[PDB]
């Protein structure tokens, strides 16, 4: 979430990111319930106040809200104890932010995201863009390994595909920012634009990428002015599920049919409907590709036709249980690197060695009944030395 993204930041980047135009307001809206009230209170105070007052300024009931809000805003570093006055820069910017100093667009965003997903899946016809392809490849959801051949889809790719559009886009933009820092694009400048949307060379490239994603559209041969789409700020279902593992989806866009075929066997395709079967073969194929039953169940539930909404639960218990059992049927091997010792002599002496590999992060599996500790070869030169020291101590 955006709260996680902002919490994972340093004070030096935080105060700079608190730009005058929008950031002080976008981060304010994040404040879930009560911290808004305290920010408004001590927006006009130039004198810090004791912490005991803030502690006792919430009744005994519902105090956990007080502690959680205080911790969240301490992490955000909106104020400092100074002994709880707010940061002067944030106070000034917030005062400046508080009395101081379309139908075609949504369709465009939908179509652009749909073609992006078409390219993501193995669609022969899709929009071509080398920058988009390499960005998706380095986002961790795609791997090519051969420039001549079109890139394939990794295991995480299917999971990302089956996610809903809001979370899908949000995670995609999170990965975009994380890779922006890697490629060298300043994070603060690009981040501030997202906040400003909900109200330079790097800016132009970032806006080009956003337009490729379909969140914005200049509409004037790439002019300075832009008109953000609905997705920039941040529908009825069509699938009918039977009790015999049969799906009737009122789908005209090929994207939905492809998504359903990812985990179902298609039987018929009518102009305004398509018939598929959820069989062991298709479900286990999806599970092997990497999906888990939770994504499939959530996808079918969110794309649930209004006819089946009346029944509770919306998705039949037999279908849900069958999908879950099919996914459980498979349990899979793992991969790690390690080295094992033996002849550990005294018992109380083996317990002290277990804490050496656990603190360094090179321990995989321990055994106090046989004395059997696995150590990765990456930290083999540090565990052996410790063992030698212990032997010397005797």
């Amino acid at each position: 979430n955006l709260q996680e993204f902002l919490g994972g930041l340093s004070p030096g980047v935080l105060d700079r990111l608190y730009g005058h135009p929008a950031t002080c307001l976008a981060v304010f809206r994040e404040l879930p319930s009560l911290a808004k009230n305290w920010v408004m209170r001590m927006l006009f105070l130039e004198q810090p106040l004791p912490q005991a007052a803030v502690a006792l300024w919430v009744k005994k009931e519902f105090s956990k809200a007080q502690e959680e809000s205080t911790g969240l805003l301490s992490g955000l570093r909106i104020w400092h104890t100074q002994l709880l006055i707010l940061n002067p820069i944030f106070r000034q910017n917030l005062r400046i932010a508080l009395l101081g100093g379309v139908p075609s667009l949504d369709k465009y965003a939908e179509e652009r995201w749909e073609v992006v997903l078409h390219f993501m899946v193995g669609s022969p016809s899709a929009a071509v863009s080398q920058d988009l392809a390499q960005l998706l490849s380095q986002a961790g959801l795609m791997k090519s390994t051969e420039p001549g051949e079109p890139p394939c889809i990794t295991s995480a790719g299917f999971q990302f595909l089956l996610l809903d559009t809001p979370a899908q886009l949000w995670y995609f933009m999170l990965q975009y920012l994380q890779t922006a820092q890697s490629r060298g694009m300043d994070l603060v400048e690009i981040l501030s634009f997202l906040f400003q949307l909900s109200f330079s060379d790097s800016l132009l490239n970032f806006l080009q990428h956003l337009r490729e994603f379909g969140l914005v559209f200049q509409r004037k041969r790439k002019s300075r002015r832009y008109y953000p789409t609905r997705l920039a700020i941040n529908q009825p279902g069509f699938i009918v599920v039977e009790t015999n593992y049969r799906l009737y989806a009122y789908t005209e866009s090929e994207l939905q049919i492809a998504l359903i075929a990812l985990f179902s066997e298609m039987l018929y395709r009518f102009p305004n409907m398509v018939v598929a079967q959820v069989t062991r073969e298709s479900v286990q194929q999806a599970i092997a590709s990497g999906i888990t039953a939770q994504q499939i169940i959530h996808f079918l539930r969110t794309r649930a036709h209004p006819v089946m909404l009346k029944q509770t639960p919306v998705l039949p218990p037999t279908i849900t249980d069958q999908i879950r059992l099919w996914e459980l049927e498979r349990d899979r091997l793992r991969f790690t690197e390690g080295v094992l010792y033996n002849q550990f002599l005294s018992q109380v002496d083996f317990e002290l060695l277990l804490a050496h590999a656990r603190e360094l992060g090179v321990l995989v599996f321990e055994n106090s009944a046989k004395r059997l500790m696995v150590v990765t070869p990456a930290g083999h030169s540090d565990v052996k030395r410790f063992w030698k020291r212990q032997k010397h101590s005797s």
Partner: protein, 393 residues
């Protein structure tokens, strides 16, 4: 005794050649210049080297050597010629080796050259590792040959490995550049079924295999079990292997060395092992007398963990006191000669118990004083002087 003396000061040189031994402060050319401790260790090393010659050339051939010497002497002892034949009553080293070579056809000149003419004992440091993939046991035996009393051994070396399929002997060739010796290991199909594990002798016993490793079949290893060299072994087993070697071995020197090596592992499984040795008649009595002192040392080391009464007290009241009165000792009947020795050695080890304050507990001192007060010896056919003297000790 001899490895302690030879590592302490130089070494004992049987058969010197005329100084041959300059590492020690007296001359070994005459018996009246020898130190008395050197004379005692000389006789001790001489009879151990004769046991080694019996190990190479069997005991019946050895008794035939001695009978040939005695028979030459007794044919010599009846002549009247003034020493034409009376010098057959005098033995030498060359005559003894020649009589050995006459009766057996083997000469012992490497063994004589190593253990007589050379004046040193050997030190063995062993450690093992079990290779689960190739099912082998990789021993690692290194010698300390740079100490002042030591020498380098290059002969063969017997090792006895007790695995789940039984006890197997292996001969290792320990040349100068040798360090790793790979010996093969057998199955672990006596852990699949509960079957009895066969011992060094022909018998077999039920073992509790819960402490054993799941991947290794081997229960214990003994380097040079028959004491066929003049050696000091320092083997690094795991503590459960020492406990299995204390419980189920049919060799008293291995039970003694496992008692000696269990003092470094104060775990409660070792306390259970020594307590099961102490309760066990049909164990040799000098092993139980050592297990008393080992149990006292282990009990001193695991204070602030010890649960019930002090060590060996409940065991003393179970073995040697009345059933109706626990604190009154039974009247003295010393006719068993093994529970007499164990009874007179158990409070002596029990008095080495110490509390968290480093003072002997007043539960053991009161127990010893009640052993002294309630002592009645008007009924046995034996005297009480050694038992009362051990009570004062």
């Amino acid at each position: 005794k001899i490895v302690a003396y030879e590592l302490k000061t130089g070494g004992v040189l049987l058969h010197p050649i005329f100084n041959p031994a300059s590492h020690l402060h007296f001359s070994i050319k005459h018996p009246h210049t020898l130190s008395w401790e050197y004379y005692s260790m000389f006789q001790c090393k001489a009879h151990l080297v004769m046991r080694l010659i019996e190990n190479r050339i069997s005991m019946e051939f050895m008794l035939q050597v001695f009978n040939k010497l005695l028979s030459l002497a007794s044919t010599a002892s009846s002549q009247k010629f003034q020493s034409h034949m009376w010098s057959q009553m005098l033995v030498s080293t060359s005559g003894f080796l020649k009589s050995i070579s006459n009766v057996s056809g083997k000469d012992i000149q490497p063994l004589i050259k190593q253990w007589v003419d050379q004046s040193g004992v050997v030190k063995f440091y062993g450690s093992f590792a079990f290779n689960r993939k190739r099912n082998v046991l990789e021993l690692e035996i290194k010698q300390d040959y740079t100490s002042p009393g030591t020498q380098k051994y290059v002969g063969p070396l017997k090792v006895t490995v007790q695995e789940l399929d039984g006890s197997f002997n292996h001969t290792l060739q320990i040349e100068e550049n040798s360090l790793k010796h790979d010996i093969p290991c057998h199955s672990k199909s006596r852990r699949n079924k509960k079957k009895k594990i066969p011992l060094m002798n022909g018998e077999e016993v039920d073992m509790d295999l819960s402490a054993m490793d799941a991947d290794s079949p081997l229960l214990w290893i003994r380097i040079d079990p028959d004491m066929s060299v003049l050696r000091k072994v320092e083997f690094e087993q795991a503590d459960f292997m020492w406990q299995y070697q204390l419980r189920y071995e049919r060799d008293v020197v291995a039970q003694q060395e496992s008692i000696l090596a269990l003092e470094k592992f104060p775990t409660p499984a070792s306390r259970l092992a020594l307590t099961d040795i102490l309760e066990q008649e049909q164990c040799f009595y000098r092993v139980r007398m050592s297990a008393c002192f080992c149990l006292a040392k282990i009990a001193n080391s695991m204070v602030s963990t010890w649960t019930g009464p002090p060590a060996m007290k409940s065991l003393f009241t179970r073995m040697f006191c009345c059933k109706s009165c626990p604190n009154i000792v039974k009247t003295n009947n010393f006719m068993s000669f093994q529970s007499y020795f164990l009874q007179k050695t158990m409070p002596v080890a029990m008095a080495l118990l110490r509390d968290v304050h480093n003072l002997c507990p007043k539960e053991v001192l009161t127990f010893i004083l009640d052993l002294i007060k309630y002592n009645d010896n008007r009924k046995n056919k034996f005297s009480d002087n050694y038992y009362r003297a051990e009570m004062i000790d």
